[PDB]
Amino acid sequence: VPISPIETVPVKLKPGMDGPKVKQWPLTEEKIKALVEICTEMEKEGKISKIGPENPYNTPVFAIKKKDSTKWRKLVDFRELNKRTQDFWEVQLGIPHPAGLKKKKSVTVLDVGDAYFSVPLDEDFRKYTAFTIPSINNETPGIRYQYNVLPQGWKGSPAIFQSSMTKILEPFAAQNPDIVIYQYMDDLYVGSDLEIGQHRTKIEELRQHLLRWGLTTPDKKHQKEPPFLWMGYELHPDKWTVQPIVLPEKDSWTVNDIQKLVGKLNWASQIYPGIKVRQLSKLLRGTKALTEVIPLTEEAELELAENREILKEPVHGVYYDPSKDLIAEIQKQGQGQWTYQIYQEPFKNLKTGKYARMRGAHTNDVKQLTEAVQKITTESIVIWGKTPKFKLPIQKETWETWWTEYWQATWIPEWEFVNTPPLVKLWYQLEKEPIVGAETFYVDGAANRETKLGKAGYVTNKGRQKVVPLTNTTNQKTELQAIYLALQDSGLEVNIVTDSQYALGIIQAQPDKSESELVNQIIEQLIKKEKVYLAWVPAHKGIGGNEQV
Amino acid sequence: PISPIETVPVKLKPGMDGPKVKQWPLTEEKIKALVEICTEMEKEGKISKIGPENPYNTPVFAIKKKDSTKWRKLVDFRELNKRTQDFWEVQLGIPHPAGLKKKKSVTVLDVGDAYFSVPLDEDFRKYTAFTIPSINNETPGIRYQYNVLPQGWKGSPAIFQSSMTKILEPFKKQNPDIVIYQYMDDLYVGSDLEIGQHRTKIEELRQHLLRWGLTTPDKKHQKEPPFLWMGYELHPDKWTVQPIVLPEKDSWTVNDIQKLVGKLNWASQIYPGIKVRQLSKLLRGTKALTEVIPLTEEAELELAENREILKEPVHGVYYDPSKDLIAEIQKQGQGQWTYQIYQEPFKNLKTGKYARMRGAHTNDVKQLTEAVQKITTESIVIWGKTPKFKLPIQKETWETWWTEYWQATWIPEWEFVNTPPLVKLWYQ
Numbered sequence A: 001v002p003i004s005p006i007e008t009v010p011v012k013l014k015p016g017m018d019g020p021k022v023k024q025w026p027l028t029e030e031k032i033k034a035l036v037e038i039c040t041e042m043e044k045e046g047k048i049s050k051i052g053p054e055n056p057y058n059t060p061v062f063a064i065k066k067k068d069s070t071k072w073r074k075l076v077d078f079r080e081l082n083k084r085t086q087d088f089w090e091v092q093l094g095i096p097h098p099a100g101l102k103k104k105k106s107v108t109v110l111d112v113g114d115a116y117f118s119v120p121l122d123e124d125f126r127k128y129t130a131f132t133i134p135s136i137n138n139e140t141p142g143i144r145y146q147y148n149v150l151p152q153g154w155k156g157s158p159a160i161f162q163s164s165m166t167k168i169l170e171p172f173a174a175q176n177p178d179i180v181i182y183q184y185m186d187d188l189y190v191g192s193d194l195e196i197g198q199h200r201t202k203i204e205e206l207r208q209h210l211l212r213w214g215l216t217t218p219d220k221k222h223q224k225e226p227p228f229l230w231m232g233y234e235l236h237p238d239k240w241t242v243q244p245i246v247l248p249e250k251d252s253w254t255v256n257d258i259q260k261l262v263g264k265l266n267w268a269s270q271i272y273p274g275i276k277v278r279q280l281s282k283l284l285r286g287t288k289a290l291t292e293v294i295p296l297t298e299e300a301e302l303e304l305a306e307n308r309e310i311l312k313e314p315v316h317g318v319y320y321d322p323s324k325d326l327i328a329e330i331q332k333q334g335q336g337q338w339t340y341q342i343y344q345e346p347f348k349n350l351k352t353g354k355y356a357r358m359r360g361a362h363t364n365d366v367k368q369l370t371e372a373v374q375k376i377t378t379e380s381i382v383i384w385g386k387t388p389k390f391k392l393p394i395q396k397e398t399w400e401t402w403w404t405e406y407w408q409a410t411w412i413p414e415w416e417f418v419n420t421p422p423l424v425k426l427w428y429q430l431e432k433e434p435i436v437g438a439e440t441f442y443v444d445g446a447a448n449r450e451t452k453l454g455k456a457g458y459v460t461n462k463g464r465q466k467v468v469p470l471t472n473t474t475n476q477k478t479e480l481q482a483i484y485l486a487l488q489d490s491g492l493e494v495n496i497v498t499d500s501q502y503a504l505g506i507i508q509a510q511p512d513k514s515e516s517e518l519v520n521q522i523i524e525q526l527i528k529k530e531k532v533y534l535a536w537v538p539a540h541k542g543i544g545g546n547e548q549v
Numbered sequence B: 001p002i003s004p005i006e007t008v009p010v011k012l013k014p015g016m017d018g019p020k021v022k023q024w025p026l027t028e029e030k031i032k033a034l035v036e037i038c039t040e041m042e043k044e045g046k047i048s049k050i051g052p053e054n055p056y057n058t059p060v061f062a063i064k065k066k067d068s069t070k071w072r073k074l075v076d077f078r079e080l081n082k083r084t085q086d087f088w089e090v091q092l093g094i095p096h097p098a099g100l101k102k103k104k105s106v107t108v109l110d111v112g113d114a115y116f117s118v119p120l121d122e123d124f125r126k127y128t129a130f131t132i133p134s135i136n137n138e139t140p141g142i143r144y145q146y147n148v149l150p151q152g153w154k155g156s157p158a159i160f161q162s163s164m165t166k167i168l169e170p171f172k173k174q175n176p177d178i179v180i181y182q183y184m185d186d187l188y189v190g191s192d193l194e195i196g197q198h199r200t201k202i203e204e205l206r207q208h209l210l211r212w213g214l215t216t217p218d219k220k221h222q223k224e225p226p227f228l229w230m231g232y233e234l235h236p237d238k239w240t241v242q243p244i245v246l247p248e249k250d251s252w253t254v255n256d257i258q259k260l261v262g263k264l265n266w267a268s269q270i271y272p273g274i275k276v277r278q279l280s281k282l283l284r285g286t287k288a289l290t291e292v293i294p295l296t297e298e299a300e301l302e303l304a305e306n307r308e309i310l311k312e313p314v315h316g317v318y319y320d321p322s323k324d325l326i327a328e329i330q331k332q333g334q335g336q337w338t339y340q341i342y343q344e345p346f347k348n349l350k351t352g353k354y355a356r357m358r359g360a361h362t363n364d365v366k367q368l369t370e371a372v373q374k375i376t377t378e379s380i381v382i383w384g385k386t387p388k389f390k391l392p393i394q395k396e397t398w399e400t401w402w403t404e405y406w407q408a409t410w411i412p413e414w415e416f417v418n419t420p421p422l423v424k425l426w427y428q
């Protein structure tokens, strides 16, 4: 019976709310007897206390049998009390990433038993946790209890436990600056560079401290020894990797199965380089029906095959050495997919990852590269608390040319060029000034929103003019189509004039790829030209405009 | 330390809870700086550690003072401000001196330290909670709350307003022509004095505040600065708007007249009295863009009329105090940036352009940052409040790098624009 002299954390109900009141009659004698057997022992240990029924509050009680029926477990549903309890500080958002851990000569894992019941509950609040064990029929007075300690499933339990643990660890860490303690949920992880004998002595010492405060640690074995299967990882003394990834074989796939698959792939991507989720996640654009059986496209099949080839043999990440420089390297996968590795030494990775651009209809390689650099910078600041040096497949002149003329402010930290094809380049550049000795194409196109017919055409200063009909199109498509016609029918140098702000918008963005075939063809033409000057004029003001519809 | 009054009781707006905001990840360097700073602040009783029963959180950052080698802690109170100060605008609100923008010189002094002498209402302290984060989520964050009036909270100068008034009273009487306005941690002092005697008067105010118990770390390098410049000086008399200019050319091509007609047609959204007709008639035929086109008399007359109407200010443009200020910035390249502060579209309360320096010092983010700071300062001087920016930058990028160059004790509201169009050159 380890009662604790731990200072309690003051707790309030949400303002204007009172304690929960719910009557529990049901159900059967057996459950009642089990509840008695449990509650007597809990009362004996001081975890709960029988109370006089003076205008109290109540909460439902259940008894649920685990596998191997030799033991029973009591389940109290506190949701209705959780509604009325005050908010607490967030407990733990993320877990620490293994790539950010430092190598230690010794690492010990400590599991604390009955953690919540070892930590007392604020006195004035205790009455709100009251519950009743039912009589065997015949409306006889039920057994009243209340919690003296943190109830399992109660809103404030994990946070209060965390702070209690921190305070308990406070005096030990003061006498032991040479060791590192990470606290996670009900577990403690103690690293040290102390010699194994000294380390084990210190661990036993810590165990004794914790036991003095009413917290238990394993006396059989000491149990966990590397691995160390933790939060989907495998932690080894000199290395870390993911737990084994298994990709199921199926003749049929639903949205759920694809979700799980893509999840496993994403998880696998942090270490195994080259993982591609694009074609497989594109099948998930079916966000309407979640139970719908989804047929696999050929692209998705090939991609999954590639991932299976990558996952064939194991790969491992290393740990972080603060004394060494931090390097990040990026490669383009070509489909709008990007992959990267973060490392210190050449044959070892701290971790890997991927960036994909789902955003936008049109984009280009340089901007995507910048976004990747951004993602990696954020991730690095989170994990190691610093920004990595970058190795990038881009010439400095390319980058400079892009950012100097770009409308958005962008910046990249210290980085150097690495030559590993494909290189990131500017595939075309529009002239800043009109070209002397070039045919001028006044272009335009229009569509009927109803009939979806539309057309596109041009007229040139040399008197040449063309008009082509279109079907199943839109005004935007007709404007782009007009520009494309002008490109097709012109020479190596061309001046185009458009009244479409949209088309000029797409072209001035300098995209190297798009999901639209038209824009792709326009891009090809633009690459094939020596000089292209695109100019814009107000529509319908009839300046130089096209009079034909 | 003693409490001059006990505490000024603070209530929230009905139906509003305290701020809960995520703390952004920080560099190890900045984390250590914050840890040091807060250890000292705890040692002085300014802040205290808190438990899990305090749900509220406010972000914190580490900047550098101005140019210094010493780290400064900057708490972002924007949310708490909106959840509190909106009710101390009415109740405790500081009146804004419309005559300040008319002065020839305006110096800015940092009075923040003063707030640290005054205790904060016991029940309100839990809303000042902030978190020094840990790297790689290794340890739970370090949690403090203020025991005294925090810098950056708009309630601080409001509470301290009376003390400030009575401290400044003797200086105001011997200098009745000097305008003094307090925005948060800052004291803006205007005068029509010659620059030298203006600086002397500012030093007089510094010594006055100092012998009255107010430190103002605007103090210099002591005697000899090597190449650098002294305390922030503004000149709101030169702060008027900017007109729209048209290119002056000896010869005009088809292209030039096309850009001209376009820009004028855009300008017609502001000035209704613009006519492009006679300029459009000259482009009637389909011609090569490089073909030089002589201007007729009608077109020239039209260009003269347009230039004449464009140099006069816009009619019916006034400041609505019930409406938020909006500042749009667009990047002009070559270290130049242009901006417009407005309320409703095409009605511009203020416009301007900034170029810091050319080459071998600064990048885009630094320039945009300094721009935002300057625009905000102007806005404060003129309307007594800051605008909400639309920033031409990627959100995550800005959220990463903005604290590097930020020298200001206040932060404005911002959102990010991925769209912006052709109109760039039209503002330059």
Ligand SMILES: N#C/C=C/c1cc(F)cc(Oc2ccc(F)cc2OCCn2ccc(=O)[nH]c2=O)c1
Pocket: A096, A101, A102, A103, A104, A105, A106, A107, A109, A180, A181, A182, A189, A190, A191, A192, A224, A226, A228, A229, A230, A235, A236, A237, A238, A319
């Ligand atoms: N179960 C389980 C494991 C949990 C766990 C989680 C962590 F984030 C760190 C952890 O152990 C470490 C504790 C303190 C440290 F300073 C470093 C730790 O690194 C773990 C990697 N490791 C493991 C075994 C070993 O001999 N050396 C080593 O660096 C254990």
